[PDB]
């Protein structure tokens, strides 16, 4: 089981040169509940973006270059990333864009958070054909004092 988890804003935008301009504690909490104990796979940029290991999860970084941090496992290719993950019920892929574009056709489940935030970014979630995916779960939330924007949690299963 290979899953992708991501927060998508308007036009599939998942990143810009800097931190997204929003504040979604509930989203990050969701991220945590659904990643905990499972191994996570990420590209180098996303690693650099987080700037610290995600605790309680085997952390795996894609990069053509040699590793620069020993608190985390570094891999040189996708098949290897998958090998580094071992025999686990479910693998979590956590970005960024280049890494999603590669793992999507190899994935059975998407954890998507939809934020109606008009934000311009050079990085996007891949285009997923709504015909290939069945939406099995959905929960919407209003913005509030702790969260800057509306967000919808969604879980998609490949038909």
């Amino acid at each position, epitope marked *: 089981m290979i899953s992708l988890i991501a927060a998508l804003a308007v036009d599939r935008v998942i990143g810009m040169e800097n931190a997204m301009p929003w504040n979604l504690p509930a989203d990050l909490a969701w991220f945590k509940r659904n990643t905990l104990n499972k191994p996570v796979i990420m590209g180098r940029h996303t690693w650099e973006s987080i700037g610290r290991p995600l605790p309680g999860r085997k952390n795996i970084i894609l990069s053509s270059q040699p590793g620069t941090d020993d608190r985390v496992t570094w891999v040189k290719s996708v098949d290897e990333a998958i090998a580094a993950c071992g025999d686990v019920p479910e693998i979590m892929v956590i970005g960024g864009g280049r890494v999603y574009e590669q793992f999507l056709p190899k994935a059975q489940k998407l954890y998507l958070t939809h*934020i*109606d935030a008009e934000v311009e970014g050079d990085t996007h979630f891949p285009d997923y054909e709504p015909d290939d995916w069945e939406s099995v779960f959905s929960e919407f939330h209003d913005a509030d004092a702790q969260n800057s924007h509306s967000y919808c949690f969604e879980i998609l299963e490949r038909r």
Partner: nanobody
């Protein structure tokens, strides 16, 4: 899939609310837009999937209001200071892509794959 309701004849300066029911998909997941055609399809207004975002054409800014009622799978276009230049057929349109995926498209009147048959709006002097 999409049925436009409301729409008839109204005197100048008059109001009139348009209605559009959409069946066949999960309503709350998709934006909804409005177009109008005069004997070329001009984009009028779009409301995002969550309702929190709205974009109005210049011809529509200030006068009109687009809103949605998920419990009734309907978007509405309220129209308030009508004039003979607004007279045309009005269509509801929906993006084929769910959520905010086609949003900048939809605001530019593109990225719509579903249309209604339209409702007539006539404004007399």
């Amino acid at each position: 899939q999409l049925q436009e309701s409301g729409g008839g004849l109204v005197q100048a300066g008059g109001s009139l609310r348009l209605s559009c029911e959409a069946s066949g998909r999960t309503f709350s997941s998709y934006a909804m837009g409005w177009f109008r055609q005069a004997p070329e399809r001009d984009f009028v207004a779009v409301i995002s999937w969550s309702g929190s975002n709205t974009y109005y054409a210049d011809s529509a800014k200030g006068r009109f209001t687009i809103s949605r009622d998920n419990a009734k799978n309907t978007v509405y276009l309220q129209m308030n200071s009508l004039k003979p230049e607004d007279t045309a057929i009005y269509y509801c349109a929906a993006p084929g892509r769910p959520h905010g995926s086609s949003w900048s498209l939809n605001k530019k009147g593109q990225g719509y794959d579903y249309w209604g048959q339209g409702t007539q709006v006539t404004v007399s002097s």
